[PDB]
Amino acid sequence: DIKISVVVPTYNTELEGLKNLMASIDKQTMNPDEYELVFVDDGSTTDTYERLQEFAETRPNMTVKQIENSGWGSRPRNIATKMAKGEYILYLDHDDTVFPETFERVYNFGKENNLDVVSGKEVRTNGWSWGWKQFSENNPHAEEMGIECLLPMTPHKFYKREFLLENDITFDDGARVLWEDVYFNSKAFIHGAKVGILADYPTYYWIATGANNSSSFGRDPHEKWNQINKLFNFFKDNIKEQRDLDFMLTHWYRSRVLGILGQWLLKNNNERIDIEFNYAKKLAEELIPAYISENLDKNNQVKDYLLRQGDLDSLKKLAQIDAGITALSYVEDAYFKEDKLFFKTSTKMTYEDKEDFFIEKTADRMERILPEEIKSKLPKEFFDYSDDLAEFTYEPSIKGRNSRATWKIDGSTSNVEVVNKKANLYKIEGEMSFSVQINDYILDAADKKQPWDIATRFTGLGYTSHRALTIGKILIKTALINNKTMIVYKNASGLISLDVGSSVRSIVEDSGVKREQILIDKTSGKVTIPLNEIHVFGESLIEGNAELKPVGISDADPINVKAKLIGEANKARVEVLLGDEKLSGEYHLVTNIQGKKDKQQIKITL
């Protein structure tokens, strides 16, 4: 009967903070009697549980319960899981929202493929990607790729309820644990769960809400490595498939242990460094097998080797040398063609978007430029980039400013070259061409009117640069394509944006008007205002209005009339319908297409 159960823990949660959440559930296309809401309050000390209980009385599919306070959301999640009746369970946190077609699409995907876990595409407020690797294409048999299919391991997936009960998969109830959701998803996979990835529709919006946690638990350096030790022991004791154990070992050794040996060494005091360095050296010796480092890139093998040697001074010097390496992309050309937007971009590896990043060519080896002092202490292959010069990636991406959803722009062609600038020094240059088909990223009705931000992702030599596309010159190009206003522009921050639906810019203002080509039809009451610079493809009819005020009347009253933006035969124009309005004299015309007024100083004599 019930397809989905929504599990939402609360604690001193005001009803106003649930307004956006409850609104996103009401907007679900799935019938309300086919899902249920299970709120479990963690023993609120204030009077917020009373207001929530009264709120649920008007909603039959919503049940609320309070337990004794546990100081954590794991026990509320478990209590609600055993209360739930639905076939699938979504763990929805009260600060987050869901997209309107999530329940319909996810359940159909899971039921038609008999999935135990549907890892749906998740969206975050910040960043240019989330789940870039896994949220690529739909995969009903995702567990065949190994335990990696569940990354990123947030709890915001849809888990089959009976599968959790049969395997007794719960959240840790006792002491608080870091990366608790990693334990939960890993336990689900090692019990043979069928995993499906739904990547073609954003399902969950994980919202950043000024996380000034102010918790000594999350800042205690000894607690941190106590939690890291038990996380790795959990891997080694429970994950028995060699392929999946080795992946989790390398992934978390790279991110959490090796991740303090880079920029982190430049923004921490010396005593904090000594404490966490000795913790990391001991953990690598005790829990990280030596073969794991063979799966790491060159720069991480150097960090691994120097860590096990206890050479903190060399790692500090290397952190200073690597600081600032990036790859910013510049727009070399941008234009509309037919029904798409085209880009030509260029990039190169630099230090802070300044001087070039170099690599030396000694003998037949492309080597990392390092001091002779540090270089004479490392294995010679670890600073040899020769085998890695053919594995650069250069791709475009897009991000909706309202939905915060992120997509890879397919169909691009790129090329990365290793060029000799001078002597034996080599830079890394990249070129790319791609087109944007905005229909590929419009899924919900609200997506049709949205500013879009364009980014570039450049990887190579172990570095990853996912940054916004930028330009120096002023760029303003307009287009009217199949009932969609489109403008590519250098925004106020100096980055490239695409405003569709006149949510930022007026297309009449940015295109300009053929001033001496305005036609006034007296017998028809139609005023034609042709647009100057604009790319028009297909038929378009966009309705707005126009305000008329007589010239020279300081306090003149607005004469609101109807207007239309018409795209027809590769030409755009605004038709101001005057009808039978009694008018005479000179007037000011101000178009208002899609809630955006122009500043073209249009005057008209009638």
- Write out the residues near its own copies by the rule CB under 8 A: 270, 320-321, 323-324, 328, 330-332, 346, 350-355, 470-474, 476, 494, 599, 601
What is the nearest approach in angstroms of Cl ion to the Cβ of residue 501? 13
Give the binding range for Cl ion (CB under 5 A) out of 66-74, 330-338, 488-496, 510-518: 488-496
Q: Which is nearer to Cl ion, 55 or 128 (CB)?
A: 128
What is the nearest approach in angstroms of its own copies to the Cβ of residue 425? 10
475 is an interface residue for Cl ion by CB under 5 A: no
256 is written with which tokens? 């959490």
69 is in an annotated binding site: yes
Q: Which is nearer to its own copies, 350 or 403 (CB)?
A: 350
Q: Which is nearer to Cl ion, 12 or 594 (CB)?
A: 594
In sign, the C-alpha dihedral spanning 556, 560, 561, 564 is positive
156 is in an annotated binding site: yes
What is the nearest approach in angstroms of Cl ion to the Cβ of residue 407? 19
Q: Which is nearer to its own copies, 188 or 513 (CB)?
A: 513
Q: Are 398 and 441 in contact (CB under 8 A)?
A: yes
Query: What x-and-dash track marks residues 492-531 binding Cl ion by CB under 5 A?
Result: -----x------x---------------------------
Q: Which residue type does 51 have?
A: R
Burial of 460: CB neighbours in 10 Å, binned 0-12, 13-18, 19+: buried
449 is an interface residue for Cl ion by CB under 5 A: no
206 is in an annotated binding site: yes
Give the binding range for Cl ion (CB under 5 A) out of 91-99, 109-117, 356-364, 489-497: 489-497
Q: Closest residue (Cβ) to Cl ion? A: 491
What is the nearest approach in angstroms of Cl ion to the Cβ of residue 401? 8
Q: Which is nearer to Cl ion, 350 or 450 (CB)?
A: 450
The string of DSSP letters for 528-541 reads: EEEBSS-EEES-EE
To which residue do tokens 């022991």 refer?
Answer: 233
349 contacts: CB under 8 Å, gap ≥ 6: 325, 326, 327, 356, 357, 427, 428, 458, 460, 461, 463
From its own copies, Cl ion, none, interface partner of 599 (C-beta below 5 to 8 A by class): its own copies
268 is in an annotated binding site: no
Q: What is the CA radius of gyration of the chain?
A: 29
353 is in an annotated binding site: yes
212 is in an annotated binding site: yes
The string of DSSP letters for 389-452 reads: TT--EEEEEEEETTT--EEE--S-EEEEEEEEEETTEEEEEEEEEEEE-GGGG--SGGGGSEEE
Q: Which residue type does 321 have?
A: I
455 contacts: CB under 8 Å, gap ≥ 6: 128, 396, 397, 398, 399, 466, 467, 468, 469
From its own copies, Cl ion, none, interface partner of 352 (C-beta below 5 to 8 A by class): its own copies
Q: Which is nearer to Cl ion, 203 or 503 (CB)?
A: 503
Give the binding range for Cl ion (CB under 5 A) out of 73-81, 490-498, 507-515, 527-535: 490-498
Q: Which is nearer to its own copies, 217 or 335 (CB)?
A: 335
Give the binding range for Cl ion (CB under 5 A) out of 27-35, 79-87, 483-491, 516-524: 483-491
Burial of 371: CB neighbours in 10 Å, binned 0-12, 13-18, 19+: exposed
What is the nearest approach in angstroms of its own copies to the Cβ of residue 223? 22
CA distances to 90, 548, 577 from 556, in Å: 58, 9, 20
Long-range contacts of 229-237 (CB under 8 A, 24+ apart): 229/283, 229/287, 230/177, 231/178, 231/179, 231/182, 231/183, 231/256, 232/283, 232/287, 232/288, 233/287, 234/183, 234/186, 235/186, 236/287
From Cl ion, its own copies, none, interface partner of 491 (C-beta below 5 to 8 A by class): Cl ion
From its own copies, Cl ion, none, interface partner of 330 (C-beta below 5 to 8 A by class): its own copies
CA distances to 93, 205, 327 from 126, in Å: 18, 11, 19
Burial track 584-593 (b if 16+ CB lie within 10 A, e otherwise): eeebbbbbbb
By CB under 5 A, how many residues form the interface with Cl ion? 3
491 is an interface residue for Cl ion by CB under 5 A: yes
Q: Which is nearer to Cl ion, 378 or 398 (CB)?
A: 398
108 is in an annotated binding site: no
- Tell me which residues touch Cl ion (CB under 5 A): 491, 497, 504
Which residues are part of a known binding site?
Answer: 9, 11, 42, 69, 77, 93-96, 156, 180, 206, 212, 330, 353
**Binding positions for Mg(2+):** 95-96, 330, 353
Binding site, annotated residues for UDP-alpha-D-glucose: 9, 11, 42, 69, 77, 93-94, 156, 180, 206, 212
